[PDB]
A paper describes a structure:
Inherited missense mutations in the [name] ([name]) gene, within its olfactomedin ([name]) domain, constitute the strongest genetic link to primary open-angle glaucoma via a toxic gain of function, and thus [name] is an attractive precision-medicine target. [name] has no known function, and there is no glaucoma phenotype in [name] knockout mice or in individuals with a homozygous N-terminal truncation mutation or hemizygous deletion of [name], but rare non-synonymous coding mutations lead to toxic intracellular sequestration of misfolded [name]. However, not all mutations in [name] cause glaucoma, and common variants are expected to be neutral polymorphisms. Among the common features associated with pathogenic [name] misfolding, we demonstrate that a single metric, [name] thermal stability, can robustly segregate benign from early-onset disease variants.
Author numbering: 244 to 502
């Protein structure tokens, strides 16, 4: 079940990009897989450049780890940065040079919804500390779909909103006290937002928490290792109960333990 994060394991490298295009990126699985996909289906996006549109899809974990894609989707619009997620059959991603989140149904290659995140900074206003236009970070946890961002009104502090996954309407919004550009990335577990302290250090920590259920903010000191010294993407998968990350060409995963 659910609980507070109390431990992160060592990063395990599952695949390594072979070109500069994959220096940063996002890779993910669907915590609520829908036909024709399964819990093994993996998606990979190498996100260096200004016209990122190729989504690599693998039917099997074995193919993701050793082979070519089983299918490539070409997005109808270029994608921004590393914050995207897959949820219940759709890729949720941010349009380049925009504050728009797009719901792209993977099995039909159809855009089903688009939504400006109200007031969200974009394109280098409130990125995480490494930059990379990481202003807007989607997240899936045990309760469904979220987006992590900030606004002028929040003065750059992390804001997070629960999202309706069908039409992308904002359902509830919380404002933390954590300056988004002062942390390396963030993710949500069991309704609690966690941040990572550094994207370069082998001795980083999960250093802040904000619990949306209680409104309480905490400091933490849970060790977190950036094995390759440049983590551009850190998300949580609530089906696997693992962190998925992209660290300097390497697609890695971390075990976790909850209280
Ligand atoms: Ca994240
Ligand atoms: Na994300």
């Amino acid at each position: 079940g659910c609980g507070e994060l109390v431990w992160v394991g060592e990063p395990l490298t599952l695949r390594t990009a072979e070109t500069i295009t994959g220096k940063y990126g996002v890779w993910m699985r669907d915590p609520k897989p829908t036909y024709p996909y399964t819990q093994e289906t993996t998606w990979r996006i190498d996100t260096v450049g200004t016209d990122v549109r190729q989504v690599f899809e693998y039917d099997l974990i074995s193919q993701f780890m050793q082979g070519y894609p089983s299918k490539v989707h070409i997005l109808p619009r270029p994608l921004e940065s590393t914050g995207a997620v897959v949820y219940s059959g759709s890729l949720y991603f941010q349009g380049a040079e925009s504050r728009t989140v797009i719901r792209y149904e993977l099995n039909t290659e159809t855009v089903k919804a688009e939504k400006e995140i109200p007031g969200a900074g974009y394109h280098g206003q409130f990125p995480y500390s490494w930059g990379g236009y990481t202003d807007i970070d989607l997240a899936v946890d045990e309760a469904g779909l979220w987006v992590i961002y900030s606004t002028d009104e929040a003065k750059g502090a992390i804001v997070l909103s629960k999202l309706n996954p069908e039409n992308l309407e904002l359902e509830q919004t919380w404002e933390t006290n954590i300056r988004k550009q002062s942390v390396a990335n963030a993710f949500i577990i069991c309704g609690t937002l966690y941040t990572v302290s550094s994207y370069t250090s082998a001795d980083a920590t999960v250093n802040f928490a904000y619990d949306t259920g209680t409104g309480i903010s905490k400091t933490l000191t849970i060790p977190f290792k950036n094995r390759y010294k440049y983590s551009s993407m850190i998300d949580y998968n609530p089906l696997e109960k693992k962190l998925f990350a992209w660290d300097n060409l390497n697609m890695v995963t971390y075990d976790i333990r909850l209280s």
